[PDB]
Ligand SMILES: C#CCCCCCCCCCCCC(=O)SCCNC(=O)CCNC(=O)[C@H](O)C(C)(C)COP(=O)(O)OP(=O)(O)OC[C@H]1O[C@@H](n2cnc3c(N)ncnc32)[C@H](O)[C@@H]1OP(=O)(O)O
Ligand SMILES: Cc1nn(C)c(C)c1CCOc1cc(F)ccc1-c1ccc2c(c1)c(CN(C)C)nn2C
């Protein structure tokens with residue numbers, strides 16, 4: 001690969017290798033005064049659009065763009081189908097900027113053909129806490145691919161982030177770009193065995209017959225942590241302490257405020273599920289997972305694979321295996337077909353015993369305008385939606 005765009009940017013070259021004595025920007029002493037005040041030029045016939053995600057119709061336009069044009073797996077079997085309510089949650093976190101929700105319209109039809117977004121948060125990288133933008137939902141319509149629109153969207157959002165005196169960003173992608181700070185494979189725990197076989201997600205063999213696969217993945221409908229219950233507003237302070245204390249061990253994590261804990265964890269049906277174990281007025285264990293369906297392309301029977309994605313999980317009164325067993329059970333009780341997790345935090349340590357299967361790819365973690373040492377994904381303590 002030539003990386004003709006990415007090598008113009010303050011990111012490491014593909015062979016760059018920094019040791020742990022280095023943890024700092026590529027470019028420092030930046031000045032808001034010097035940031036370009038003009039919008040980046042689009043090709044003739046296209047215009048920038050300020051998306052108001054709190055407006056149902058603008059939000060539905062983003063939803064349609066992503067439903068038809070967003071991420072597919074490597075074999076083009078599935079396409080993510082984030083719900084409109086999910087997009088509202090993901091994009092309106094504390095202190096979010098409407099002007100960081102950037103659309104591109106094709107003038108002649110007035111239809112949205114491109115999108116990119118960022119939200120602000122404090123990111124701790126190798127013990128240094130930096131205000132960053134978290135970039136997500138970059139999407140160009142399938143009919144306009146490989147026309148160099150993506151670098152325009154990236155340059156325009158960079159400009160708008162810089163106008164807020166923010167000079168670093170965090171982002172994830174499946175493609176390999178210069179240059180990952182970490183790389184985490186994803187794994188899958190079957191819940192609805194027959195459906196997964198019928199859609200070609202899982203496989204059988206002469207030893208693993210259908211009935212044997214169903215028995216293998218069967219789960220007992222009893223929690224190891226008996227009092228695990230849906231999180232409520234009263235639990236925000238305790239989750240903030242429990243999760244915040246846990247995350248400090250990692251090389252990369254968000255430093256959540258109490259307002260951010262309330263936003264990212266208080267349950268929303270079909271969006272975000274958080275369960276807590278309260279003992280003596282203290283939150284001692286937590287489970288959380290978000291809902292991200294994938295459209296099953298071409299399937300006449302099933303429109304979607306209903307998947308729960310592991311978010312943040314902490315235990316102090318059980319083993320991590322027992323906690324994640326309860327997470328799988330809670331996903332099953334909420335009608336999910338599969339439970340998906342990355343090999344971040346303590347997750348990989350339970351994948352064999354809890355009967356996860358390895359997926360077919362990995363999610364790379366990246367920083368913009370930051371040079372530092374890379375690390376194994378068990379040292380990652382952040383999950384991007
Ligand atoms: C401070 C502040 C800084 C703020 C900015 C920080 C950097 C942020 C980078 C963006 C991060 C995005 C995180 C995501 O949200 S993840 C999900 C990605 N969503 C999809 O997977 C949906 C399906 N897919 C698509 O919609 C399109 O394929 C895309 C992804 C829009 C790409 O458009 P297409 O038409 O292919 O490509 P064109 O417009 O010719 O642009 C080619 C250049 O672009 C680079 N690129 C491609 N995919 C990228 C990607 N996902 N993230 C970043 N860069 C990407 C690529 O390498 C190349 O540049 P070079 O020539 O190699 O230097
Ligand atoms: C099922 C299924 N459906 N689809 C459509 C796929 C790709 C799968 C495979 C299963 O992927 C995963 C499983 C996990 F446990 C955790 C993460 C992913 C994942 C993979 C690639 C990803 C994304 C998320 C995102 C979205 N955020 C993070 C930017 N972008 N990219 C390019």
Ligand SMILES: [Cl-]
Nearest residue numbers: 221222223226
């Ligand atoms: Cl129970």
